[PDB]
Amino acid sequence: KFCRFTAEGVQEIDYKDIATLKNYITESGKIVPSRITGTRAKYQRQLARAIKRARYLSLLPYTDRH
């Protein structure tokens, strides 16, 4: 119920692990707020960066309907 990344000690959310990245995007492809997901601010920023890079690399959708 806390930030899983600071629970695990990982300090960067690598954008190549879509299995983790999916946990933090709504089914409509939007990023889930840090309030909802419980992630602390630093990892939320890192997570948003990684999500955006994955969206560029087509590993995640920019949105559900394309």
Binding site: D14, K16, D17, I18, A19, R53, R55, Y56, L57, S58, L59, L60, P61, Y62, H66
Partner: protein, 103 residues
């Protein structure tokens, strides 16, 4: 000598030409004295959204220790090579020699 992560996704029709691409690129970097530290071919993956009406593409990852100059010639290579449909090169804090999460 800066650590780079190069991900480029290739037109599926050129899946046979991807090994040649990799060999010539690694030859260019090693000639420029830069070291490739990681290299893995994701194969042909489906796309989360169509690119140029293409729904599948051949992903290549490679982490290098190349000079910024030779990285820029690889930039122009990806630009003027019509098979590489999308490329992204990133500076990393350090070299990564582990195994990518998609392996």
């Amino acid at each position: 000598m800066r650590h780079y992560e190069i991900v480029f996704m290739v037109h599926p029709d050129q899946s046979e030409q991807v090994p040649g691409m990799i060999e010539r690129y690694t030859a260019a970097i090693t000639g420029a004295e830069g070291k490739i530290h990681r290299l893995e071919d994701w194969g042909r993956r489906q796309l989360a959204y169509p690119i140029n009406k293409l729904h599948k593409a051949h992903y290549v990852l490679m982490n290098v220790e190349a000079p910024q100059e030779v990285i820029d010639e690889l930039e122009t290579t990806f630009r003027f090579n019509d098979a590489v449909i999308r490329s992204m090169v990133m500076r990393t804090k350090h070299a990564v020699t582990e195994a990518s999460p998609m392996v």
